[PDB]
C-alpha cells in the first residue's frame, strides 16, 4: 500500500497531500511523473529524490509481470 511506501522512505507527511491529489492507489501513484511530485507539495530537493527514485522502482515493479 501507498502508506507503507511513503512511511518506509520517511515521507510520512506526504501521504496526506498524495491521497488528496487523487493518487490514493499505487496504480495512480506510479503514473505521476516528476512534475506532479513537486506540485502536490514537495519543495525540498531531497524529497524530490526520495520519492522519484522510489517511484522509478514502483513503475518498474508493476512492469515486471
Amino acid at each position: 500500500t501507498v502508506s507503507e511506501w511513503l512511511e518506509s522512505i520517511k515521507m510520512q507527511q506526504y501521504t496526506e497531500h498524495f491521497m488528496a491529489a487523487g493518487y490514493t492507489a499505487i496504480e495512480k501513484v506510479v503514473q505521476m511523473t516528476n512534475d506532479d511530485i513537486k506540485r502536490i507539495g514537495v519543495r525540498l530537493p531531497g524529497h524530490q529524490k526520495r520519492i522519484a527514485y522510489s517511484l522509478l522502482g514502483l513503475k518498474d515493479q508493476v512492469n515486471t509481470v
Binding site: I9, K10, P45, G46, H47, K49, Y53
Partner: protein
C-alpha cells in the same frame, strides 16, 4: 532525530541537510546507503565514510 547522534562524530552541523531528504529519523537513517547520501550534500568520500562509521559506532 540525529542531533546528538551526529554530535558525537562532529557532523551535527550537517543534520538539517539530511532533513530535507527525509533522513531526519534514526528509524531508516540507520540503514542508509552511500547512494542515498550524496543527495543530502554528503557526496564527499570522507564524509560518506564518516557517516557509515557512525552507523556502527553510535548505531
Amino acid at each position: 532525530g540525529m542531533s546528538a547522534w551526529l554530535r558525537a562524530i562532529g557532523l551535527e552541523r550537517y543534520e538539517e541537510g539530511l532533513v530535507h531528504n527525509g533522513w531526519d529519523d534514526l528509524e531508516f537513517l540507520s540503514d542508509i546507503t552511500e547512494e542515498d547520501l550524496e543527495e543530502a550534500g554528503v557526496q564527499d568520500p570522507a564524509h560518506k565514510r564518516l557517516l557509515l562509521d557512525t552507523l556502527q559506532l553510535s548505531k
